[PDB]
Write a protein that binds this ligand. Structure first.
Ligand SMILES: [Mg+2]
Ligand SMILES: [Mg+2]
Ligand SMILES: [Mg+2]
Ligand SMILES: [Mg+2]
Ligand SMILES: [Mg+2]
Ligand SMILES: [Mg+2]
Ligand SMILES: [Mg+2]
Ligand SMILES: [Mg+2]
Ligand SMILES: [Mg+2]
Ligand SMILES: [Mg+2]
Ligand SMILES: [Mg+2]
Ligand SMILES: [Mg+2]
Ligand SMILES: [Mg+2]
Ligand SMILES: [Mg+2]
Ligand SMILES: [Mg+2]
Ligand SMILES: [Mg+2]
Ligand SMILES: [Mg+2]
Ligand SMILES: [Mg+2]
Ligand SMILES: [Mg+2]
Ligand SMILES: [Mg+2]
Ligand SMILES: [Mg+2]
Ligand SMILES: [Mg+2]
Ligand SMILES: [Mg+2]
Ligand SMILES: [Mg+2]
Ligand SMILES: [Mg+2]
Ligand SMILES: [Mg+2]
Ligand SMILES: [Mg+2]
Ligand SMILES: [Mg+2]
Ligand SMILES: [Mg+2]
Ligand SMILES: [Mg+2]
Ligand SMILES: [Mg+2]
Ligand SMILES: [Mg+2]
Ligand SMILES: [Mg+2]
Ligand SMILES: [Mg+2]
Ligand SMILES: [Mg+2]
Ligand SMILES: [Mg+2]
Ligand SMILES: [Mg+2]
Ligand SMILES: [Mg+2]
Ligand SMILES: [Mg+2]
Ligand SMILES: [Mg+2]
Ligand SMILES: [Mg+2]
Ligand SMILES: [Mg+2]
Ligand SMILES: [Mg+2]
Ligand SMILES: [Mg+2]
Ligand SMILES: [Mg+2]
Ligand SMILES: [Mg+2]
Ligand SMILES: [Mg+2]
Ligand SMILES: [Mg+2]
Ligand SMILES: [Mg+2]
Ligand SMILES: [Mg+2]
Ligand SMILES: [Mg+2]
Ligand SMILES: [Mg+2]
Ligand SMILES: [Mg+2]
Ligand SMILES: [Mg+2]
Lengths: 271, 93, 46
RNA sequence: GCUCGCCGGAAGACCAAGGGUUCCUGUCCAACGUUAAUCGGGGCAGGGUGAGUCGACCCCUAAGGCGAGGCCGAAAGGCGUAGUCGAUGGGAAACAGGUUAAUAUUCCUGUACUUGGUGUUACUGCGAAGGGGGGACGGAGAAGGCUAUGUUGGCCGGGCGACGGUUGUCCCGGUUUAAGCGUGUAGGCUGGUUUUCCAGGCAAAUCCGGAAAAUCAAGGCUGAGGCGUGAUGACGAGGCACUACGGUGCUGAAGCAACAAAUGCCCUGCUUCCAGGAAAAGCCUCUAAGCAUCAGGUAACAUCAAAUCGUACCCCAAACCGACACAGGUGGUCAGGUAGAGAAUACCAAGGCGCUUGAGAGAACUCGGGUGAAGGAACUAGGCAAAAUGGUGCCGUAACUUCGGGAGAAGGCACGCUGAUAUGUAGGUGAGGUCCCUCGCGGAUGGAGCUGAAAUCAGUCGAAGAUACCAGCUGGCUGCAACUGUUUAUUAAAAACACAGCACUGUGCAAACACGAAAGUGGACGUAUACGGUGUGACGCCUGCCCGGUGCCGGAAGGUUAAUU
RNA sequence: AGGACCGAACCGACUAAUGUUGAAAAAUUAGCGGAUGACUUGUGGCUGGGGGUGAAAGGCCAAUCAAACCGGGAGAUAGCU
């Protein structure tokens, strides 16, 4: 459900929100909570190393089981919850032995549905299996890059990965970006896509909305003096130069990937 | 238990003033100048021993010394401790 | 208006106090210089 | 001392921060005080700050700091693990009355409370660095129930009025009482209890989590206020005795109700929204090792202890920051009356002040104001400045529009007082009395009393009734920028920056990128619906041709070409 | 409901006059803008000089900023006065 607001004020005119009435309305599961205090894009030297980060709402961190290693015991979905730390929704699940966890909520998952992980689970959304046991051509998410490490790919709202080919110890994956990547067949993955695929349809509407998410304003380089940016200067609006980063690197087309260690797993670049 | 030498050193002088006289005639309280590091219990034991009266409660305060002038020279008097020692209503030390 | 000096004893002692100087070799050189010059007041502490 | 004037959401009061004797008393007037000074925040001397309950200290953590080993670095050092620090946050306990020249929740009187140690008695499973629960948390909004507080009436004491009237439906004043302890209320949340079993809680768990029955269908947690008690006490208007004229001393009346009412309390509640809202200990409860007719624990009771440091005084200011006794700056709390929507504003209370040169005169001219014949923008770069408008209710309101707006468009009418409707209405509150039941802080009814708008009709005064203060000028065309924001502290607030939106581009995660000789850290406890860079700048209709030049992307036949040999 | 509306506190600074050896090394007085938010404020913390930070004015970094301040190289050099 994508609902757009009425223009009762100029700040509301263009706002388009994403509303899910299915999501829990009370507090999150407390024992799976942790603090995550903000950084402002400052590292341990206290220097800004990523620009335009600051402020925003206070958030608590929800421990999310990306490994899905509780193998054998069925679990049932208790409720779907809002997570401030990521674009996707999360689901509080109860295993048959009384252990509760948070998982990423696949599309279609509702309260009461049965999930299971392991080598001997079934082919249905929310079930984690080694990619050795998942048929070629399935849609998966929360994919592992090393066996045992935890899901690292296809985690954001609406994303998925496709198993294109299995050959020997490796499986060929088509990522959301379009890159064709090999991964060990022992790496686990969850059936189905990530839900909340309407997340991309929202419109913030006003500057304050981006400030609520901890995003500070971007100043264009062409708007400043030459001492503090290569684009700076000009009597009036002048450019006359090839666009670069604030540190002088060409910023329209120049490739920056440089990793010979992982080159043997890229079957084909996104292009 | 506080030794006798300590007790002999803790008490300095019986403070004199109009307020101290009035405390004596109204609340049976004597006011004393004591050691800067003397605690309430040390003062109580020393009063009960050296003056041979019964104490129930002691009240203490530290006084700040005043800055002065002596022929344009900047000087300062020392901090000191004053004790309000209330006696058990039958002593008149 | 609001002038540049706003006294705060805690911030003063933390910035320029004796233990703040003693905590780094450069602060100890500050103290050595001031002793060699013969300053009556080594730091802000008292 | 009597008058007058000023502030009164402060120019009163109380604190934090900062200062540090400026506090109080005697004395002195050289210098200091923008004049004099008998005065002083000045000189000199003396005095003055009393705590188990307030605060610090202490226990616990945030950001952050330091950091045994460790990793890294010519050296100096950098980072960081276990730890240990770090409040602006969490953690036990006291109230009222009196008293000094100067302190008081600290002294005194009355009445309370908390934590812990030792002992004695009685019952007993006690035990952590480990498990669980709790502590524990956002914004907005709405309603009810209260109190602080006020007003009126009853009551009590006093009054009979400098000039006409004032024994009354008259005047003045007072009419106050805490924490604690019992009650458990308006209301908020939750279904209980007892069994059996279990892949969970780093092992054990009787605890928590899960599962299956039985059993009752109400139990439990929390909770403002009131009531009782505290209190036969305290305080009390006033009288009477001295006065050393600064005040002391003694006594002591009434001490009730109704209505109105917070932005405070119930309420960390309830409803709702998205941007999804600390930590750790105190605390409660599980057990492991271990002790085991002992230790330990529970309850009661007696007894001891609760140290140390601060406490004066100023604190929107003559004591702090501004070189000054400087039109400046400086966080929090309290919050009376009449009018008013109001913490606006006007006049006042409590309280505090008249701003540390005065006396005359009544020229030009300067500054801050009031009024102005006739004219009314003719002024001027420009209506700069000024004049003007200005409230509530009701009628009415155009182009255009993104259908919200435009709009308070524009414009207009009414408005004081008195009487009547109605000896005081609609509404609000609500005593008695009658009755019902699981008897109460219950329930149904009932309505005295108190309070009380607004409207209509008729009269009436004035030049004027939103009468003071307070309080939109309005409209028409057009450039720029969508909008709310931001900026040259101290000559520029804008058309500049940002912005939501758009596009290109990089980035497969030990991401790109940034900070760092490095180790590492941020990006991110994120994973392409993500993150970085760049340009453009809501929205609508759109965004054409050129790859010659420069940049980037791809290619690898041929030429040229480094160290090396 | 709202970066909604009118309007005090509070935050700011558009116009004018005054002041310019000022009451003030940036204020006063009358008007003015925002006033539930990209708000504002207390306490503490971190970022250090070719460095920081900057909704970007070369702004700000202790009345100092097209490279702070203090000490040193240091009696720099000065075909100039
Ligand atoms: Mg960015
Ligand atoms: Mg942008
Ligand atoms: Mg510029
Ligand atoms: Mg350059
Ligand atoms: Mg040009
Ligand atoms: Mg050109
Ligand atoms: Mg005492
Ligand atoms: Mg004391
Ligand atoms: Mg003095
Ligand atoms: Mg005085
Ligand atoms: Mg004289
Ligand atoms: Mg004089
Ligand atoms: Mg004096
Ligand atoms: Mg730490
Ligand atoms: Mg360190
Ligand atoms: Mg070491
Ligand atoms: Mg600590
Ligand atoms: Mg604190
Ligand atoms: Mg006093
Ligand atoms: Mg009341
Ligand atoms: Mg309010
Ligand atoms: Mg005091
Ligand atoms: Mg003066
Ligand atoms: Mg002043
Ligand atoms: Mg202020
Ligand atoms: Mg006012
Ligand atoms: Mg004149
Ligand atoms: Mg004039
Ligand atoms: Mg006039
Ligand atoms: Mg005229
Ligand atoms: Mg005329
Ligand atoms: Mg005319
Ligand atoms: Mg003209
Ligand atoms: Mg002319
Ligand atoms: Mg004007
Ligand atoms: Mg005017
Ligand atoms: Mg009438
Ligand atoms: Mg033009
Ligand atoms: Mg604009
Ligand atoms: Mg604006
Ligand atoms: Mg300026
Ligand atoms: Mg300006
Ligand atoms: Mg990394
Ligand atoms: Mg532009
Ligand atoms: Mg607004
Ligand atoms: Mg500004
Ligand atoms: Mg003004
Ligand atoms: Mg406005
Ligand atoms: Mg406004
Ligand atoms: Mg400066
Ligand atoms: Mg330079
Ligand atoms: Mg040299
Ligand atoms: Mg020279
Ligand atoms: Mg020459």
């Amino acid at each position: 459900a994508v609902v757009k607001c009425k223009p009762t004020s100029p700040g509301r005119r263009h706002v388009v929100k994403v509303v899910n009435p299915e999501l829990h309305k009370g507090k999150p599961f407390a024992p799976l909570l942790e603090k995550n205090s903000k950084s402002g894009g400052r590292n341990n030297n206290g220097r800004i190393t990523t620009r335009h980060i600051g402020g925003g709402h206070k958030q608590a961190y929800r421990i999310v089981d990306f490994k899905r290693n509780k193998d054998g015991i069925p679990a049932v979905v208790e409720r779907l919850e809002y997570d401030p730390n990521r674009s996707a929704n999360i689901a509080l699940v109860l295993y048959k032995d009384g252990e509760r966890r948070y998982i990423l909520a696949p599309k279609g998952l509702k309260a009461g549905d049965q999930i299971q992980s392991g080598v001997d689970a079934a082919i249905k959304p929310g079930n984690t299996l080694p990619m050795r046991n998942i048929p070629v051509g399935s849609t998966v998410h929360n994919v592992e890059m090393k066996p045992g490490k935890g899901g690292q790919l296809a985690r954001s709202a609406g994303t998925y990965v496709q198993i294109v080919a299995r050959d020997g110890a490796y499986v060929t994956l088509r990522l959301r970006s379009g890159e064709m990547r090999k991964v060990e067949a022992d790496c686990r993955a969850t059936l189905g896509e990530v839900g909340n695929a309407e997340h991309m349809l929202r419109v913030l509407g006003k500057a304050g909305a981006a400030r609520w998410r901890g995003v500070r304003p971007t100043v264009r380089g062409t708007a400043m003096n030459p001492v503090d940016h290569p684009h700076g200067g000009g009597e009036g609006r002048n450019f006359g130069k090839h666009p670069v980063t604030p540190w002088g690197v060409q910023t329209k087309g120049k490739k920056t990937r440089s990793n010979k260690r992982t080159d043997k797993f890229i079957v084909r670049r996104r292009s | 238990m506080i030794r006798e030498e300590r007790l002999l050193k803790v008490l300095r002088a019986p403070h004199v003033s109009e307020k101290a006289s009035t405390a004596m005639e109204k609340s049976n309280t004597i006011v004393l100048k004591v050691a800067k590091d003397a605690t309430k219990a040390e003062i109580k034991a020393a009063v009960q021993k050296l003056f041979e009266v019964e104490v129930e409660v002691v009240n203490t305060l530290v006084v700040k010394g005043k800055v002065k002038r002596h022929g344009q020279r900047i000087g300062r008097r020392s901090d000191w401790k004053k004790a309000y020692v209330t006696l058990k209503e039958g002593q008149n030390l | 208006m609001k002038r540049t000096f706003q006294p705060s004893v805690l911030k003063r002692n933390r910035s320029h106090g004796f233990r703040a100087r003693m905590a780094t070799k450069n602060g100890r050189q500050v103290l050595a210089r001031r002793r060699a010059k013969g300053r009556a007041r080594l730091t802000v502490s008292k």
